[PDB]
Design a protein around this ligand. Structure first.
Ligand code: PKZ
Length: 469
């Protein structure tokens, strides 16, 4: 680390392989040349498309992603054409009779699985000399590949956590104010406990400082735990204003406070670590950006988790039908009641136009350490623009009415496999010296580790075992 990072135009090219391989898998599956029953060929193809391709893209072919993105796509298209040439239900009454329910979407499963796979690879890949130094994290100002996961995980959690509000809306009795706090504590208990355990153990660890990231005591597992508890209190205010109008206000207030004078920056950068507040400045101050990211994720998760469009679902959680509203509908309810793709396109366009003008006037640059406005804009725009393609692929190929096994397996056992991967890298880091390894040895070690994780994950999934911590 310690070097200025790369650019966005390289990060996009490096990370597009996750969507390219998904499209290739869909094409190959629809080519109909594969045998119907499960076999070794299916597992080999799945493992080569999911795990190995990302490993090659991150490490060896990092200097030529455009050449890698075609050798996977073209043969599958040729096979699809060959199969198509060689080869010899939706009802409106159902939609009328259907009520409002939650549904499990496949592209969300793929989007969650790919991020976990990439995180699991890149956690260990950073300790070897074959991993380019441009992708390592940067201190204060700068952009890199490893500064995006921290925002992406918060965005994904915000997207998912809206189904609780959608479900509780159908309830005929309002839960008490003290009951939601208990629910939030129950949801965040394991993360809070694992975060607190590190404070009691750092003294025994006596590892490197790394204080400048979050502080002496603060941690990411506390930031993830405290968000729902704080956002519980916000609902009475949202009774009067839309949810996004709170994120906008918070972002504007924080940016005005940062750009008003240089005193705040001087305190944040040069102040001595004397008292508790001075020893955890960054962890406390990045909360005002993480809250905005979480709120925007929650707002985005309103029109994706349903099974049919409802009334005013672009900005409000609602279950009212639009069939009765279709009689002499106004010009507002016609535009603010959309299918998932229509909402995603509108929000992507608005955020692109806002960011393209914000980036031309901000004197400073992106900074994860403080989580200022440009970082949030970049994090949100990237995720919206990837979800748009992920959703469009399903509509083009027509499967909205399962996905590769290695994606579902890693999606169904997230936290446990994350901890297992962390322990594995911790073991390899002490079983050998990494910085003095030859490239072939490094590649073999990475391949063996990937195979071990994949085998364990699939074995847990087949036998129907789900571990909740
Ligand atoms: C493509 C890549 C793009 C981004 C590309 C950018 C770069 C990407 C990083 C790369 C650069 C290296 C890496 C940097 C970053 C670090 O180096 S480190 C980052 C730090 N990471 C962490 O701390 C891990 C955080 N983990 C968590 O927040 C969570 O525990 C997990 C593991 C993500 C998910 O946990 P969980 O929510 O308990 O999971 P789970 O119970 O399975 O699901 C929860 C809910 O979702 C529901 N659900 C699940 N699937 C679905 C579905 N398909 N539909 C609907 N609902 C669903 C479940 O039914 C459940 O519903 P409820 O029961 O809540 O009602």
């Amino acid at each position: 680390t310690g070097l200025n990072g790369g650019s966005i135009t390289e990060i996009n090219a490096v990370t597009s392989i996750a969507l390219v391989t998904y499209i290739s898998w869909n094409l190959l599956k629809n080519s109909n040349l594969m045998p119907p029953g499960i076999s070794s060929v299916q597992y080999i193809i799945d493992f080569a498309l999911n795990w190995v391709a990302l490993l090659l893209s991150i490490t060896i072919y990092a200097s030529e992603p455009y050449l890698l993105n075609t050798l996977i796509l073209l043969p599958c298209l040729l096979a699809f054409i060959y199969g198509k040439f060689t080869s010899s239900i939706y009802n409106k009454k159902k939609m009328i009779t259907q009520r409002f329910q939650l549904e499990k979407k496949p592209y969300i499963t793929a989007y969650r699985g790919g991020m976990l796979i990439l995180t699991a690879i890149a956690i260990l890949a950073v300790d070897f000399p074959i991993f380019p130094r441009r992708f390592a994290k940067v201190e204060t100002w700068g952009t890199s590949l490893m500064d995006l996961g921290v925002g992406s995980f918060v965005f994904s959690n915000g997207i998912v956590s809206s189904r609780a509000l959608l479900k509780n809306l159908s309830l005929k009795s309002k839960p008490s104010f003290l009951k939601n706090a208990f629910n939030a504590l129950k949801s965040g208990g394991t993360l809070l406990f694992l975060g607190l355990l590190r404070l009691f153990f750092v003294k025994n660890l006596e590892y490197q400082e790394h204080v400048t990231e979050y502080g002496v005591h603060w941690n990411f597992f506390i930031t993830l735990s405290l968000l729902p508890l704080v956002l519980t209190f916000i609902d009475p205010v949202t009774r009067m204003v839309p949810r996004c109008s709170i994120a906008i206000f918070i972002s504007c207030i924080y940016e005005w406070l940062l750009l008003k004078d240089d005193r705040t920056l001087n305190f944040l950068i040069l102040a001595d670590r004397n008292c508790f507040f001075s020893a955890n400045r960054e962890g406390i101050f990045s909360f005002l950006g993480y809250c905005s990211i979480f709120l925007w994720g929650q707002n985005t998760g309103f029109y994706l988790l349903g099974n049919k469009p409802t009334l005013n679902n672009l900005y409000k959680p609602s279950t009212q039908d639009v069939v009765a509203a279709s009689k002499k509908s106004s010009t507002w309810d016609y535009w603010t009641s959309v299918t998932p793709l229509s909402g995603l396109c509108i929000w992507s366009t608005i955020f692109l136009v806002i960011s393209q003008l914000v980036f031309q006037y901000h004197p400073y640059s992106v900074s994860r350490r403080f989580a200022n406005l440009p970082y949030t804009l970049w994090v949100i725009t990237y995720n919206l623009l990837f979800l748009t393609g992920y959703c469009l692929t399903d509509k083009i190929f027509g499967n909205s009415s399962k996905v590769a096994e290695c994606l579902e397996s890693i999606n169904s056992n997230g936290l446990f496999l994350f901890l297992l991967a962390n322990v594995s890298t911790g073991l390899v880091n002490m079983s050998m010296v990494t910085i003095d390894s030859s490239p072939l040895k490094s590649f073999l070690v990475l391949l063996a580790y990937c195979s071990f994780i994949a085998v364990i994950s699939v074995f847990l999934y087949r036998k129907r075992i789900f571990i909740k911590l």
